[PDB]
Enzyme design. Structure first.
Site, PDB file in Angstrom:
ATOM      1  N   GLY A  15     -13.320 -26.732   2.648  1.00 40.20           N
ATOM      2  CA  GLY A  15     -13.173 -25.270   2.637  1.00 40.20           C
ATOM      3  C   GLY A  15     -11.939 -24.862   3.410  1.00 40.20           C
ATOM      4  O   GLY A  15     -11.298 -25.750   3.984  1.00 40.20           O
ATOM      5  N   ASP A 122      -9.813 -12.541   0.554  1.00 37.25           N
ATOM      6  CA  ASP A 122      -9.265 -13.853   0.123  1.00 37.25           C
ATOM      7  C   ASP A 122      -9.923 -14.341  -1.171  1.00 37.25           C
ATOM      8  O   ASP A 122     -10.247 -15.540  -1.266  1.00 37.25           O
ATOM      9  CB  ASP A 122      -9.347 -14.886   1.242  1.00 37.25           C
ATOM     10  CG  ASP A 122      -8.485 -16.100   0.956  1.00 37.25           C
ATOM     11  OD1 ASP A 122      -7.483 -15.966   0.189  1.00 37.25           O
ATOM     12  OD2 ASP A 122      -8.802 -17.176   1.475  1.00 37.25           O
TER      13      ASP A 122
END
Ligand code: HH8
Length: 293
Positions: A15, A122
């Site tokens: 991630g 994002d």
């Protein structure tokens, strides 16, 4: 001791903030996505508030766990992300009806969060997750407010600029919900054309790719833009391209919607709620995708 009140634990990948594991809860037997965040109490409070931010097009945040000075986020597991699905769909394209269904669901997810004054900041294909039943869901909502958005991940992989709104790139201090509409517009165009719309590899390359397509912004289309922290009078002056050239073979309705999602002025940019009422969605359906799991 934490990875022990999970029956087992394997690695989905890497991630922004930490490793992502697939894991089973031992009390419930449920399969979850576990994200380790590596290192702050204000972040804990704010992220815990997202456990209430529930919607069928938002990846469910099951738990927030602070232990041994590490943070673990427990999420609903989905089998596939839109990046992998687009890559799997490269020879044929995603069928228009499925593109329309996914955009519609993503706008419902955005409308819900934005109504609660939560933004993503994002959005990218990697955090849009899909299931076998034709649903698409937004992952990592509200995390960017918590931890910021770094230039590099914990494994030093480059965080993508391709979906970043121009106000962020020009150094605006205050985000609005319009940043998410910009990102989703970029993703829409990428589903249609099977190519990223603005694949910048630096902040200036990202801005100049935006300029070369939509025209160099000016006081006409964006009041105040020439006063932004990172605006330079020396920016090259590119003319705007017709959307007919940028996203063939999208119809007039889709090009109209995409144009409103990509307005320079965040104020002028269409909201999630108004986008749901756009004539592009008059004939929207919910097709079943072809998923290889
Ligand atoms: Br499932 C899955 C895979 C990758 N990233 C994810 N991020 C958030 C929630 C679920 C995820």
């Amino acid at each position: 001791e934490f990875m022990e009140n999970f029956q087992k634990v394997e690695k989905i990948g890497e991630g922004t903030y930490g490793v992502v594991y697939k894991a089973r809860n031992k009390l419930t037997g449920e399969v979850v996505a576990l994200k380790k965040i590596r290192l702050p109490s204000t972040a804990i409070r704010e992220i815990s508030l997202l456990k209430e931010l529930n919607h069928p097009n938002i990846v469910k945040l099951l738990d927030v766990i602070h232990t041994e000075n590490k943070l673990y986020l427990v999420f609903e597991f989905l089998h596939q992300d839109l990046k992998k699905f687009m890559d799997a769909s490269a020879l044929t394209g995603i069928p228009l009806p499925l593109i329309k269904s996914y955009l519609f669901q993503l706008l419902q997810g955005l409308a819900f969060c934005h109504s609660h004054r939560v933004l993503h900041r994002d959005l990218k294909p990697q955090n849009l997750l899909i299931n076998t039943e034709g649903a698409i869901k937004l992952a990592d909502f509200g995390l960017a407010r918590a931890f910021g958005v770094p230039v590099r991940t914990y494994t030093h992989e480059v965080v993508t600029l391709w979906y970043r709104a121009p106000e962020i790139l020009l150094g605006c201090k205050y985000y609005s919900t319009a940043v998410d509409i910009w990102s989703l517009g970029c993703i829409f165009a990428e589903m249609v054309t099977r190519r990223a719309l603005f694949p910048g590899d630096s902040e200036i390359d990202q801005l100049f790719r935006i300029f070369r397509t939509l025209g160099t912004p000016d006081e006409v289309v964006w009041p105040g833009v020439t006063s932004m922290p990172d605006y330079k009078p020396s920016f090259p002056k590119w003319a705007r391209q017709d959307f007919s050239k940028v996203v063939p073979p999208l119809d007039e309705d889709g090009r109209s919607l995409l144009s409103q999602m990509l307005h320079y002025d965040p104020n002028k940019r269409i909201s999630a709620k108004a986008a749901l009422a756009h004539p592009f969605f008059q004939d929207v359906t919910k097709p079943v995708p072809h998923l290889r799991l």
